[PDB]
Amino acid sequence: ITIISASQTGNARRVAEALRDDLLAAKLNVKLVNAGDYKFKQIASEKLLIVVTSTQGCGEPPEEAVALHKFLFSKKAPKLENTAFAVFSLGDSSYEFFTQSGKDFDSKLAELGGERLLDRVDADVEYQAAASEWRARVVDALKSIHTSPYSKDAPLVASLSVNQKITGRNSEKDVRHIEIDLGDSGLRYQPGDALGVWYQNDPALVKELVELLWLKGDEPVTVEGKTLPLNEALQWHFELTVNTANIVENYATLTRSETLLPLVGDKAKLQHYAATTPIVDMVRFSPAQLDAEALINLLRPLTPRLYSIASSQAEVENEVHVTVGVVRYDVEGRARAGGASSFLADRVEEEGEVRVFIEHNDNFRLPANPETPVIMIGPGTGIAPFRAFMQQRAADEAPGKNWLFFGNPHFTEDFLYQVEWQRYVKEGVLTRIDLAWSRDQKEKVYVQDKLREQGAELWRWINDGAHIYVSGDACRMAKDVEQALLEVIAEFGGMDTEAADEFLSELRVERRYQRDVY
Amino acid sequence: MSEKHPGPLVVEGKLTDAERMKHESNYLRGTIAEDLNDGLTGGFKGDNFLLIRFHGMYQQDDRDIRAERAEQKLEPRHAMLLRCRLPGGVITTKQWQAIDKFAGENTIYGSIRLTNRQTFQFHGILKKNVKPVHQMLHSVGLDALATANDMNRNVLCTSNPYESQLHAEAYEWAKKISEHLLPRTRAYAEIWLDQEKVATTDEEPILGQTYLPRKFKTTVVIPPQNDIDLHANDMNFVAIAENGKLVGFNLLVGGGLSIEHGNKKTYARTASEFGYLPLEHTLAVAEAVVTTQRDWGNRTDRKNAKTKYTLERVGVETFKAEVERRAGIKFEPIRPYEFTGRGDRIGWVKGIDDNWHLTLFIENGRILDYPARPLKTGLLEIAKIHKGDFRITANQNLIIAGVPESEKAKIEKIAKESGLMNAVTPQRENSMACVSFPTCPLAMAEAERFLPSFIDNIDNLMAKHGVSDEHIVMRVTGCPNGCGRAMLAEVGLVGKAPGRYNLHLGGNRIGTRIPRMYKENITEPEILASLDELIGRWAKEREAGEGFGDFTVRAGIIRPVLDPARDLWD
Numbered sequence A: 001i002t003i004i005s006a007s008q009t010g011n012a013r014r015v016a017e018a019l020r021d022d023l024l025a026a027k028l029n030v031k032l033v034n035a036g037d038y039k040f041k042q043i044a045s046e047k048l049l050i051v052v053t054s055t056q057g058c059g060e061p062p063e064e065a066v067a068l069h070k071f072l073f074s075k076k077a078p079k080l081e082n083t084a085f086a087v088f089s090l091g092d093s094s095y096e097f098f099t100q101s102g103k104d105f106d107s108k109l110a111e112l113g114g115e116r117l118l119d120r121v122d123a124d125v126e127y128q129a130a131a132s133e134w135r136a137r138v139v140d141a142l143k144s145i146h147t148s149p150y151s152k153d154a155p156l157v158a159s160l161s162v163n164q165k166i167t168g169r170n171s172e173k174d175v176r177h178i179e180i181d182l183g184d185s186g187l188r189y190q191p192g193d194a195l196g197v198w199y200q201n202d203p204a205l206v207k208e209l210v211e212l213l214w215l216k217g218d219e220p221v222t223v224e225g226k227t228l229p230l231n232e233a234l235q236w237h238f239e240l241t242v243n244t245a246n247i248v249e250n251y252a253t254l255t256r257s258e259t260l261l262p263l264v265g266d267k268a269k270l271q272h273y274a275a276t277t278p279i280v281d282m283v284r285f286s287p288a289q290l291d292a293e294a295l296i297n298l299l300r301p302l303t304p305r306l307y308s309i310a311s312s313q314a315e316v317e318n319e320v321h322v323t324v325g326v327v328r329y330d331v332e333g334r335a336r337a338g339g340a341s342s343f344l345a346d347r348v349e350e351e352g353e354v355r356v357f358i359e360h361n362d363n364f365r366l367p368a369n370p371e372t373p374v375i376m377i378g379p380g381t382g383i384a385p386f387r388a389f390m391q392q393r394a395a396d397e398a399p400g401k402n403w404l405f406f407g408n409p410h411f412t413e414d415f416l417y418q419v420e421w422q423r424y425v426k427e428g429v430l431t432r433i434d435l436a437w438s439r440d441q442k443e444k445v446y447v448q449d450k451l452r453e454q455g456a457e458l459w460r461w462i463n464d465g466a467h468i469y470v471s472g473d474a475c476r477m478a479k480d481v482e483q484a485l486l487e488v489i490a491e492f493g494g495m496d497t498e499a500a501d502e503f504l505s506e507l508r509v510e511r512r513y514q515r516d517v518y
Numbered sequence B: 001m002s003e004k005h006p007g008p009l010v011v012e013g014k015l016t017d018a019e020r021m022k023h024e025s026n027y028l029r030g031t032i033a034e035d036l037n038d039g040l041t042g043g044f045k046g047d048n049f050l051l052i053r054f055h056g057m058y059q060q061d062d063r064d065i066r067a068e069r070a071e072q073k074l075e076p077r078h079a080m081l082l083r084c085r086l087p088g089g090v091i092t093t094k095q096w097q098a099i100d101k102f103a104g105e106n107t108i109y110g111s112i113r114l115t116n117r118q119t120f121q122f123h124g125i126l127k128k129n130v131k132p133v134h135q136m137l138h139s140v141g142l143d144a145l146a147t148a149n150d151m152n153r154n155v156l157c158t159s160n161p162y163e164s165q166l167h168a169e170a171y172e173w174a175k176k177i178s179e180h181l182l183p184r185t186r187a188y189a190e191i192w193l194d195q196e197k198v199a200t201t202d203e204e205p206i207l208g209q210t211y212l213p214r215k216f217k218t219t220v221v222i223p224p225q226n227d228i229d230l231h232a233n234d235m236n237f238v239a240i241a242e243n244g245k246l247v248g249f250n251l252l253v254g255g256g257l258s259i260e261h262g263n264k265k266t267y268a269r270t271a272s273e274f275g276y277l278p279l280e281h282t283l284a285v286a287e288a289v290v291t292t293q294r295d296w297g298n299r300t301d302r303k304n305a306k307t308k309y310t311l312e313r314v315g316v317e318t319f320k321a322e323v324e325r326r327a328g329i330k331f332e333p334i335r336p337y338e339f340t341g342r343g344d345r346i347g348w349v350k351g352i353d354d355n356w357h358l359t360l361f362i363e364n365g366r367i368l369d370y371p372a373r374p375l376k377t378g379l380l381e382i383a384k385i386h387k388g389d390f391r392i393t394a395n396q397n398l399i400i401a402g403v404p405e406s407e408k409a410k411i412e413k414i415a416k417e418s419g420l421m422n423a424v425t426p427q428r429e430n431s432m433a434c435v436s437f438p439t440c441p442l443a444m445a446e447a448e449r450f451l452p453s454f455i456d457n458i459d460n461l462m463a464k465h466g467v468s469d470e471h472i473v474m475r476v477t478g479c480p481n482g483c484g485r486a487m488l489a490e491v492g493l494v495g496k497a498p499g500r501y502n503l504h505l506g507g508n509r510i511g512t513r514i515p516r517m518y519k520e521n522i523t524e525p526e527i528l529a530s531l532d533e534l535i536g537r538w539a540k541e542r543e544a545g546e547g548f549g550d551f552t553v554r555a556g557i558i559r560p561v562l563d564p565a566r567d568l569w570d
């Protein structure tokens, strides 16, 4: 019996840690191994295999489990004979893909003949009840942060030092450079980590939502074990900038609006509606005299947003830099915005109160050997961890070669940290930089095109043991860049597409192909 | 021997870095082709930053957003200024359509900036469009070679003589002079036009390996018009005609207006008369003068290299003797020439060829699509309809030349509807300014964006003083370089700091006298107060047909400059 934990942020990690605890207390044996240190090519020699997984940008497993997932899809997976399996999957209904990684894992493990002792079950953001009721049944049908006080639950109360836009005035996107002074708290981080920022909803948005429901704003509501006014709760503890299908169909059910009832039962229409309109506009389409308690039950708890750290403590000491791409969109001429990005962009004064913590990411790190070449693909707001990488390597005077791929719409407006990159290539820290400006000419050009153009040099670097890092969008960028890498590897390695995929999976296994995508 | 000019023929000293850059550039090639292919920076690195000027482009950034981009972790918005080589200012309607299309499409500002040297300028050209602009210029038969850095500048010709029959010969000679003094190098064609390299070295028999010490500027003057301001440029060929045909030229050497604030060694002096040369000796004389300046220039000091400084150092007599020896000719005595004015002839002007010339007043020479004032679109429609060619004027104005009687009504209808020739006071027509902000790297004060409001105030002032029908040549520069030629106007405002200028008075209507500095480092309200007092004085106690500069000199409020090399600053 072995428990497999496939988690990036770590919500499945704690579930697997609790699971192994009562398995070792009750049965005996039971060993726990993450997907990153699992000898997955010896899967056929397993007795009992429990998989606890997560779901990234769209259905893909966590980056450490991508190798195992591709193994199960490679037609080279062995035929299972003496192992029983049970799959527990986490996820979030807000996103388009709800625990599809667990569904795929369960389906394949069944297809290769694994004994499904427990059927796969789905977990929402509130996984406490599901995990607690799942581990008991797992046990029944089976018996034949390093040291800092700060964490997600108790974030460090830091201060905002610098909030500077790093895009030109003629840029369609608003990208901020946020410098947060950690003070004397001694918070420690590494390049590749993420800064979980607790935010607060816009007071204007909260007021508009409250008056849109014909409420006052000071009526008491029940939050946790205390009583707080409605505005306080909607600003500090509830999410308003994200619309989910569940929120929409609950509004329809507790409202019976003629314009919302027909959409109930159609997952595609509900998801499109949720992704197209915010909560406040969705309730603007149909005010329904909803009381404070109904609003509180309808919404979801506010959660911190992770941002890749754009600085290294070897250079900035007690500061953390994050590159915040502000989400700004207009619905019927009313300018709406994202929660945390707009909170950091507008709603925090200089030296203001920002509650942050560190989300450690071990599977996105610079090579331990300073001489190892590094290839980075960071178009858009994915340039932050590579700025941290460059600062860390320049501080250590690492002699290794560095290759950066950056992409954005406009060169004169969307070149993030351009002067820093010019300085880095001036001093030889950044050996090569390749830029792809998609909106500078008639034809769209992205980073993957530059990877295709530089196939021979990329292949030589990979043969030199280089590390490939991808950070940025996951819906389109990550898949396109992975395809470009596969094409380059297949073309310049003298081998077909399947062998290219196997080579990329091997690179993932040797911690040489690492992604931080969102 | 006069003690005024005791200096040697060639000054000895450490050569400037620019001369080294010219010497080691391998005949204007550099690494411009290689520098074009990098995307890390939007400009040209190394010596290419100055070598690209030899090909006609200036690397520039917007100074309105320079600090904002500096604090935005962004490099300055490096964009190129493409100045074309148009001898005499004559541009065909097909070429105008091409440049209009390029400015509308592949240029940040979307504007055609006419200059005072009878050519246009493209601002905000990205490095990726640096090659396509030269490609299209070659496609429509133009080029931008040797219009910046240290070669011959754009050659000027009077764009609208009263007897518009010598313009053909004068423009032909201006084009011949411009082509003669072009560099004989293949760098321009190899880099932009993509011509196969020849396995041999260049010669440059006209300019040499190191080229001229400074920029050289030439003009062709047809009296009595002086719109080209021949005293602001080195060589001037004052055309002389007998029986209605060109018979010779008058050579005036030693022009220049650039000064330095507080540097007595820099001055603005008027060109000195050399002599009359027969018509057939124009090219030889131009060659002799250019080569004499090349040999005797001050390559150790870049604020001492222009032909005026060489003239004042070696003496006019020795320079003339060397020019005569080099050209193998003798300078005949100067036949008399007179100047009536300096401005443009706005409106419809009848030509000898039964064609009408339409001079459009364009404010600051900026062609754009302003609200309810679509100058660019109207000009494009005119070019589509017109069958002649456009003549850019030295006053940053455009002349629609050779319009027949039948098409006169149509051209007037399209121009009037587009706001190209709407009502404008006479004072505004003789008011000019340099580009300055936000593009000029050396700009200290506002000239182009300050001229309209300033002239509005001045027009109101003249209306108050009842002299609104009269005009004063008023030129504002945001730089001591005098690019707007403020050092030849009746009232000149040379920039000193943002919002502060130096007021210069005592100029001339015909532009043959430098205006002496009156008050320095005074903001706009002080300038308007002083000019109000002086216009009120002028509007009463003036004579019949007296200009403002002549009145200021005569009234004793300012003293004229006689020899600018001695008493301009004193």
Ligand code: SRM
Binding pocket: B058, B060, B081, B083, B114, B115, B116, B117, B118, B119, B120, B121, B123, B153, B154, B215, B217, B229, B232, B233, B234, B255, B256, B257, B258, B306, B396, B433, B434, B435, B436, B439, B440, B441, B442, B481, B482, B483, B484, B485
């Ligand atoms: C456009 C124009 C003024 C205008 O509004 O019309 C102009 C514009 C500039 N001039 Fe000029 N000069 C212009 C006529 C002049 C003239 C007047 C004339 O030729 O009739 C002079 C004063 C007379 C003289 O110098 O003899 C002039 C003397 C200069 C100088 C000073 C040269 C010197 O002797 O020290 C500089 C500075 C330099 O050369 O480095 C300069 C530099 C410049 C630059 C290229 C600034 C720079 O060095 O980067 C300007 C580009 C502005 C921009 O952002 O686009 N410009 N400049 C004229 C274009 C001429 C052309 O197209 O060929």
Ligand SMILES: Cc1cc2nc3c(=O)[nH]c(=O)nc-3n(C[C@H](O)[C@H](O)[C@H](O)COP(=O)(O)OP(=O)(O)OC[C@H]3O[C@@H](n4cnc5c(N)ncnc54)[C@H](O)[C@@H]3O)c2cc1C
Binding pocket: A194, A241, A242, A243, A275, A276, A277, A278, A305, A306, A307, A308, A309, A323, A324, A325, A326, A327, A329, A330, A337, A338, A339, A340, A341, A342, A381, A382, A384, A516, A517, A518
């Ligand atoms: C490991 C990791 C690293 C990250 N690193 C970074 C980083 O370096 N930089 C960075 O900027 N972000 C980064 N993120 C993303 C970050 O956590 C947030 O997702 C992002 O900043 C937006 O936060 P928000 O709360 O303001 O947006 P939200 O308010 O949560 O999202 C806005 C909502 O509006 C919707 N919406 C968007 N546009 C429209 C439109 N036009 N019409 C209608 N609806 C629309 C969206 O779908 C979404 O539902 C990272 C995420 C992770 C997990």
Ligand SMILES: Cc1cc2nc3c(=O)[nH]c(=O)nc-3n(C[C@H](O)[C@H](O)[C@H](O)COP(=O)(O)O)c2cc1C
Binding pocket: A006, A007, A008, A009, A010, A011, A012, A013, A053, A054, A055, A056, A057, A058, A059, A090, A091, A092, A093, A095, A096, A097, A098, A099, A100, A517, A518
């Ligand atoms: C960028 C991003 C994309 C996500 N996409 C999905 C998704 O498509 N479907 C889903 O069910 N959950 C999605 N989630 C939610 C995660 O599955 C959820 O956070 C999970 O519990 C991860 O926790 P763990 O890292 O501790 O295992 C997404 C989360 C993030 C940050």
Ligand code: SF4
Binding pocket: B434, B435, B436, B437, B440, B441, B442, B443, B444, B445, B447, B477, B478, B479, B480, B481, B482, B483, B484
């Ligand atoms: S005079 Fe000075 S500010 Fe004006 S165009 Fe010339 S260099 Fe620029």
Ligand SMILES: [K+]
Binding pocket: B362, B363, B364, B365, B395, B396, B397, B429, B431, B432
């Ligand atoms: K003008």
